Homo-oligomer: A and B are copies of this chain.
């Protein structure tokens, strides 16, 4: 979707002051909150935790949270419990009532959040095969006067009416979360998720169930899931398994959702997080799942090349070339005209960014400066390896940002004109062969082999030295890159030297046509 490390949704409490009563408080897409990057996924998300810390109590000040979270119920899919990258769950307080009679506000009930968050969003995934993910899921409901969800939460405290139904409520007493052993057909403890991810076809399906207390089949299914995978993200729908027919509907899971979204985390996407909001705005869900406890394709490139030390770091990215993720904050690259330039301060003081180009849509590259640090960056969404064209002669044209020196330093931005930085590449896909040239003043020569949706080769200053306007002699510099966008219209790469002349360069070119 619009990408992020995580999302949280707060419980609602309904005003029941007589004469100024809200009959209902619905959930809204706008209610979703970003969590930010967690240092430790097992801990509560910091922004929302701080909110709850300040929530007033009167008799019980503790924060209660999902049992596997960092402060004897269980909530886990057996064989799939050792999360390292992604956590979902809930936390709350027995919040004091708001009793503001002269402003006509009375509110009572728990206050808290459901959430998921993760670290290390994936840049590679299995190339093929169907893989089973299991884990947990959580929910929070709207509030409506007279409403109860007695099938899921015993309504002695007006859960669903005065404050949201949620999966952490003390009266959620129909799951097996407190039992000591499992029935033969239980998937685990409490509310659990089961997803089948088809990396071959870039899609996934799943089921969200409750494992039922034993006091006849022991689970109940509330949703099935369907989603398309794009890069490290996925988007789709949730289908309510029991909606309204012969029943008056004793639970909140009665409407489909068209807003299922999530993403993969970890080295090869072995964990995932997701959320959705029901179309009738009655229920929000978050969840997490992982491969069983213990060949790849690359879906994106996102790198930072630091000048001062010529070093190259991987950046996080949510499979969106136009969204630059640095230091856990998200910097957009298009203003909701070749190249571009601007600065940005969140909430390092400010970020200065120069980005190219206007004609590129799956690939962005340029300059990044913190304040003072300076780096180049490149990020792109790789084309599916199965979409790599077979054409034997393909020309790409564009530019590049350059920083090089054997004595004094030369720096040159990218440009469309005139004798400024220019790049050209000819690719023989059939041969798995790639070559091209970068010129400043009319010089590097690059040979490489294509592998899947990526390439790898060398860049040399040739013979001998370059200019510095003193000869810089770079030869056998490792060059890595990729093809971005559908059907590989855009391509990009970078190189650092060494692995008395230095060099750091990002470049990107666009495909032509007869």
Any B CB within 8 A of the CB of A147: yes
Binding site secondary structure of chain A: loop
Given the complex, which residues of B lie within 8 Å of A18, measured CB to CB? 145-146
Separation of A434 and B24 alpha carbons in the complex (Å): 69
Cα of A21 to Cα of B21 in the assembled complex, Å: 11
Q: Is A22 interfacial (CB-CB < 8 Å)?
A: yes
In the complex, the answer to whether A146 meets B23 with C-beta atoms within 8 Å is no
Interface presence of A422 (CB below 8 A): no
CB closest chain-B residue, reference A22: B23
* B residues in contact with A147, CB < 8 Å: 19
Tally of this chain's copies: 2
Q: Does A462 contact B (CB under 8 A)?
A: no
Distance from A196 Cβ to chain B, minimum over Cβ atoms (Å): 38
Q: How many angstroms from the CA of A366 to the CA of B19 in the assembled complex?
A: 57
Q: Which residues of B contact A145 (CB under 8 A)?
A: 18-19, 21, 23
The answer to the question of A144 belonging to the interface, with a C-beta cut-off of 8 Å to chain B, is yes
Q: Which parts of A125-154 form the interface with B (CB within 8 Å)?
A: 144-147
A20 at the interface (CB under 8 A from B): yes
B-side contacts of A21, CB under 8 Å: 23, 145-146
Q: Which residues of B contact A146 (CB under 8 A)?
A: 18-21
Interface string of A9-35 (1 = CB under 8 A from B): 000000000111111100000000000
> Taking the nearest CB of chain B, how far is it from the CB of A12, in angstroms?
15
Which residue in chain B gives the minimum CB-CB distance to A19?
B146
Least Cβ–Cβ distance between A13 and chain B, in angstroms? 15
Name the B residues within 8 Å of A22 (CB-CB): 23
Residue of B nearest to A15 (CB): B23
Give the chain B neighbours of A24 by CB distance below 8 A. 23
Residues of A within 8 A of B (CB): 18-24, 144-147
